[PDB]
Ligand binder design. Structure first.
Ligand code: SJY
Ligand code: SJY
Lengths: 139, 139
């Protein structure tokens, strides 16, 4: 289905990175938050769903099932939250390659997301993740 | 061309809203920032261009031409900044319709962006802005 995402967290320099993956394309969006709160996840989901068809979000643990705001975001935007489900180390190599081009970690995280979404697999031919998600939604 | 945007600022409850419009689709992305700094605009442009083809950004005044970080963002991401160029009152009516569904202004701003991007013109038939930008990029 064209609206399936995976949501996860990752950690770098004592900061928290929210990562959404569009499962069929590998497109990612990410955001650095001060702390891993309900509100932050709800805000991120609402932005995401305003940009793409988001039908179902898959997570790997219980954290998101206990936030009052995440459930009000789910419901407002029409997002099914489903339990049950790598990319998270591609990110980190690219973050390492750019880290000292940016003062702020968040900048490096977005430079990493950029390159993840724009590049071709193996550097030649076919579609980027950013091309594939557009191509998937367009049909 | 498929990569042309308009960037502008707007103000509500003493907070600053950055608005990017995809000129051919009317798709919008927006973000509430504490203050109207170079860094914030650069960060927003870098996120945007990591998500969509952004070839040229049109602005209406000189503010963006005097930020060292905005120029380093332009150059890093391959974005031509061009001088010379409404939607900004559709936003505000919808913000008013949702305002007391959300504690934070930023939430109302994203609920407004959601509805702006998802709705059909006149409420029936054709494509939403979010459909049109995908349809434009897919060709
Ligand atoms: C080449 C490039 C592209 C985008 C960029 O965004 C920022 C920023 C920022 C912030 C916004 C709010 C709080 S910090 C920077 C500056 C850095 O990180 O070097 C930067 C540099
Ligand atoms: C239905 C719905 C959907 C998304 C939402 O995001 C937030 C938030 C937030 C924040 C993140 C960081 C600092 S404040 C809220 C709560 C509110 O504004 O009522 C909310 C409610």
């Amino acid at each position: 289905s064209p609206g399936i995402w995976q949501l996860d967290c990752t950690h770098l320099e004592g900061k928290v990175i929210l990562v959404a993956v569009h499962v069929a394309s590998g497109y990612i969006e990410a955001e650095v938050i001060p702390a891993e709160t309900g509100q932050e996840t709800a805000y991120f989901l609402l932005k995401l769903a305003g940009r793409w068809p988001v039908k179902t979000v898959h997570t790997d643990n219980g954290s998101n099932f206990t936030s009052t705001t995440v459930k009000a975001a789910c419901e407002w935007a029409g997002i099914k939250q489903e339990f049950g489900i790598a990319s998270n180390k591609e990110l980190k190599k690219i973050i390492g390659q750019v880290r000292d081009q940016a003062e702020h970690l968040k900048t490096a995280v977005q430079m990493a997301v950029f390159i993840h979404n724009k590049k071709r697999k193996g550097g030649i031919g076919g579609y980027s993740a950013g091309e594939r998600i557009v191509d998937i939604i367009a049909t």
